[PDB]
Design a protein around this ligand. Structure first.
Ligand SMILES: *[C@@H]1O[C@H](CO[C@@H]2O[C@@H](C)[C@@H](O)[C@@H](O)[C@@H]2O)[C@@H](O[C@@H]2O[C@H](CO)[C@@H](O)[C@H](O)[C@H]2NC(C)=O)[C@H](O)[C@H]1NC(C)=O
Ligand SMILES: *[C@@H]1O[C@H](CO)[C@@H](O[C@@H]2O[C@H](CO)[C@@H](O)[C@H](O)[C@H]2NC(C)=O)[C@H](O)[C@H]1NC(C)=O
Ligand SMILES: *[C@@H]1O[C@H](CO)[C@@H](O)[C@H](O)[C@H]1NC(C)=O
Ligand SMILES: *[C@@H]1O[C@H](CO)[C@@H](O)[C@H](O)[C@H]1NC(C)=O
Ligand SMILES: *[C@@H]1O[C@H](CO)[C@@H](O)[C@H](O)[C@H]1NC(C)=O
Ligand SMILES: *[C@@H]1O[C@H](CO)[C@@H](O)[C@H](O)[C@H]1NC(C)=O
Length: 650
């Protein structure tokens, strides 16, 4: 009863409602032009069928009454458009609609009744990122035989789902279902079993309580289950294994699940992602499920209570790239056969466990290892020299263990090493010379070991070193002034060693300088206002004001005066030099350290008066001038007077 006689009129009725066309999509929407050539419109057989204005950024106050007469419209894609629209307007759409994408389209209001049960030709429904407050319509699942894809994710939908009746005969096409990002409450419905062809079910980021239903085992075709970030409790039901003929992604993280990991997951030979992290899962880890996970790429178990020996069957996971056991009760040792079994292992994380034993040298045979974290365990032995074969290793983290021996010189073969964190171990010896071929190292932490020798001068050739922590060792000698060549060092910790001599004038990143290690660090470049910036042989605002920010030198045997070049480290915030043998006056340049916040110069032998330049230290919240030989009227301007008097004793 209509033709383009009515369709072309309908499309231009929409242009009237539009009050802003940022990209001018509706520019060619003219009655002199046919709707078949209208931007974003498609016809089949002469009548309008599709109208795609998604992402166009259109802005208006629109109503869907300008589509009703379009009784040939099968696709309606108006996603990502800044126009207001009432939720009841869904009922004014053509019943010939099959696809419907209204993501971030500006819908407001509770979902209307008699829409999902009315539009019985919709196969795909995406109404995500709107404001459908309130509950779901009772008719949501009553007559949707052909609905395959229902995405109502990321609204403010509240209320329960266990009230919705789901007839077996009306949820037969449903494969993709996404209600994530809402405030839906109550127990997970046992009725979702009736959607027998579910392949993807996502209910993450809601307020579901109660247990994972045993009925979910009946979703034989399920490939992807995400119940994460809810309040689900209880044991992971073993029936879930009855979906293992299809399951590829299982996400139960951020709930409060107790009990053991079900052994039935040993049949999930197609599993690719397993995230049980951030629960209270406990009990002996069933090693046998790992022998079936030949296709597993991601294993997230962190932040649980999982006990038992660290699983030795992890060598069967030939596809595993990420293995995260952080914060569990794993005992035993690191399996020596982990490698080359886990041939694609890239991140091995098991900090905060009860794992003992040595680091197996075979771990060098996991060729793809990028990150190793073994901290807060009970490991012994020595760092195997074979560790230098992990050419792709960027993090070796193993602080708070009982590792002994010397630092193997083979570490210099790690050209990609960026973080070497070994503090609170029992490493002895001198820092090997070959260690300094790690030119890309950014964070070195040797705190609280038994290292001896002197701080090597070759710490200056490391142009990317940002944090250096050597505190509480048996280092001797003088502070190498080469440390002042580091163009990026901003944190220096040498406290509690047997270091003598003076304090070098310039240390760490100096005013100016930049991380760049090529031509852009020199000045051979030229400005030519075919170029603009050329390398003729013979910028960096803000960053040229960066310098050391944390300098702890306390509890050593240093002598001499405090240099006045330390006043040029404007970005300094913490300056702890207490318990040395320093003398002389306090430089007036200290007042230039505006952002200084901590100044611990106790148990030295300083003399003179305190410069009133300290008044400019607006951010000084802690000072400590105990056990010195100072004298004079303490500058009352600033915070120095607001600080306690015990910081000026003796
Ligand atoms: C590194 O330590 C292991 C730790 O083994 C046991 O576990 C600890 C929690 C603690 O109770 C230790 O005293 C235990 O020994 C040592 O492994 C033992 O090694 C001895 C031989 O020296 C052997 O007879 C034990 O059976 C081993 N125990 C095991 C495997 O549980 C290991 O010797 C230590 N390595 C080094 C190089 O000192
Ligand atoms: C289930 O829903 C979420 C909703 O966001 C999907 O998106 C990812 O989920 C994480 C969970 O922390 C969000 O923070 C991220 O924004 C999303 N990450 C991406 C797209 O990489 C999530 O993927 C869905 N899960 C499954 C198994 O389909
Ligand atoms: C599935 O639907 C049938 C009718 O189609 C109904 O009898 C049954 O109770 C439903 N199952 C649920 C709600 O778990
Ligand atoms: C989670 O389970 C643990 C272990 O049984 C329990 O102590 C805790 O109270 C639970 N937390 C919540 C938030 O339900
Ligand atoms: C176990 O429940 C406690 C209860 O407070 C919660 O803090 C914690 O997240 C859960 N366990 C872990 C390991 O996260
Ligand atoms: C880095 O230094 C070590 C020791 O001198 C050497 O074996 C290694 O080959 C050097 N660099 C590279 C890229 O191999």
């Amino acid at each position: 009863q209509s033709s383009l006689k009515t369709d072309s009129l309908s499309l231009l009725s929409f242009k009237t409602m539009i009050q802003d066309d940022p990209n001018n999509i509706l520019s060619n929407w003219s009655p002199r032009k046919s709707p078949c050539q209208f931007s974003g419109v498609t016809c089949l057989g002469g009548r309008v069928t599709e109208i795609n204005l998604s992402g166009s950024g259109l802005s208006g106050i629109v109503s869907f009454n300008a589509f009703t007469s379009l009784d040939s419209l099968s696709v309606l894609k108006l996603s990502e458009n800044f126009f207001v629209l009432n939720s009841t307007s869904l009922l004014l759409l053509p019943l010939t609609l099959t696809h419907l994408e209204l993501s971030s389209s500006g819908l407001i209001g509770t979902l209307p009744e008699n829409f999902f049960s009315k539009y019985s030709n919709l196969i795909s429904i995406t109404l995500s990122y709107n404001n459908f407050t309130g509950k779901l319509p009772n008719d949501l699942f009553l007559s949707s035989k052909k609905l395959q894809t229902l995405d109502l994710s990321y609204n403010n939908i509240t209320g329960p789902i266990s009230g919705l009746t789901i007839p077996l005969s009306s949820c037969v096409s449903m494969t993709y279902l996404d209600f994530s990002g809402n405030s839906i409450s109550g127990y997970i419905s046992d009725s979702l079993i009736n959607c027998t062809n579910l392949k993807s079910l996502n209910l993450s980021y809601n307020n579901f309580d109660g247990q994972i239903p045993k009925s979910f085992g009946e979703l034989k075709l399920l490939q992807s289950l995400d119940l994460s970030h809810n309040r689900l409790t209880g044991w992971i039901p073993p029936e879930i294994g009855d979906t293992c003929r299809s399951l590829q992604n299982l996400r139960l993280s951020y709930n409060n699940f107790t009990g053991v990991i079900p052994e039935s997951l040993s049949s999930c030979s197609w599993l690719q992602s397993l995230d049980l992290s951030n629960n209270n899962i406990s009990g002996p880890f069933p090693n046998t499920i790992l022998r079936s996970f030949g296709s597993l790429q991601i294993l997230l178990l962190s932040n649980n209570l999982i006990s038992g020996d660290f699983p030795t069957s992890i060598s069967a996971c030939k596809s595993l790239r990420i293995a995260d056991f952080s914060s569990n009760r794993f005992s035993g040792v690191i399996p020596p056969d982990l490698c080359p079994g886990a041939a694609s292992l890239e991140e091995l994380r098991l900090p905060d466990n009860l794992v003992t034993g040595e680091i197996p040298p075979a771990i060098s045979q996991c060729s793809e290892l990028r990150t190793i974290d073994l901290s807060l365990n009970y490991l012994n032995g020595t760092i195997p020299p074979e560790i230098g074969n992990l050419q792709k290793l960027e993090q070796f983290i193993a602080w708070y263990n009982n590792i002994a021996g010397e630092i193997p010189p083979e570490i210099g073969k790690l050209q990609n090493l960026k973080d070497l964190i070994l503090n609170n171990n029992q490493l002895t010896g001198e820092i090997p010379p070959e260690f300094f071929n790690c030119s890309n190292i950014e964070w070195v932490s040797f705190t609280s070991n038994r290292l001896t020798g002197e701080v090597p001068k070759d710490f200056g050739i490391l142009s990317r070193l940002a944090v250096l922590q050597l505190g509480n060792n048996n280092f001797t000698g003088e502070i190498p002034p080469e440390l002042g060549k580091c163009t990026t060092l901003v944190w220096l910790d040498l406290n509690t060693n047997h270091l003598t001599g003076e304090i070098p004038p310039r240390l760490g990143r100096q005013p100016g300088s930049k991380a760049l290690s090529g031509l852009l660090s020199g000045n051979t470049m030229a400005f030519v206002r075919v170029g603009g910036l050329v390398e003729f042989s013979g910028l960096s605002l803000f960053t040229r004001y960066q310098t050391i920010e944390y300098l702890d030198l306390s509890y050593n045997q240093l002598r001499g005066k405090i240099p006045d070049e330390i006043g040029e480290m404007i970005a300094l915030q913490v300056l702890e030099l207490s318990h040395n043998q320093l003398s002389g006056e306090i430089p007036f340049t200290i007042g230039q350290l505006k952002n200084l916040g901590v100044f611990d110069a106790s148990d030295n032998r300083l003399q003179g008066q305190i410069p009133e330049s300290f008044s400019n230290l607006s951010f000084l919240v802690q000072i400590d001038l105990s056990n010195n030989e100072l004298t004079g009227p303490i500058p009352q301007r600033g915070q120095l007077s607001t600080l306690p008097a015990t910081q000026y004793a003796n």
